[PDB]
Amino acid sequence: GIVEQCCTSICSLYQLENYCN
Amino acid sequence: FVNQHLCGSDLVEALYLVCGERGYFYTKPT
C-alpha cells in the first residue's frame, strides 16, 4: 500500500515512518 | 523531508533511510 500513497502520490515522513518498525 | 513521488527502490531507500536499523516492511504488492 505505501506504493500508492508515495508513487501515485507524494508521501509524508509520518506515512514513511509508519511502515517502519 | 522533501515532497517527491518516490517509486522503484527510491521509496524503499527512504525507509532504509528513515527506518535505518529499526527495520521496515516493504512488500504486499498492491
Swiss-Prot record, chain A:
Highest taxon, organism lineage: Eukaryota
Cysteine-cysteine disulfides: 6-11
Protein's name according to its UniProt entry: Insulin A chain
Organism: Homo sapiens (Human)
Gene symbol of the encoding locus: INS
Residues included from the entire protein: 90 to 110 of 110
UniProtKB/Swiss-Prot annotation, chain B:
Top-rank taxon: Eukaryota
Protein name per its UniProtKB record: Insulin B chain
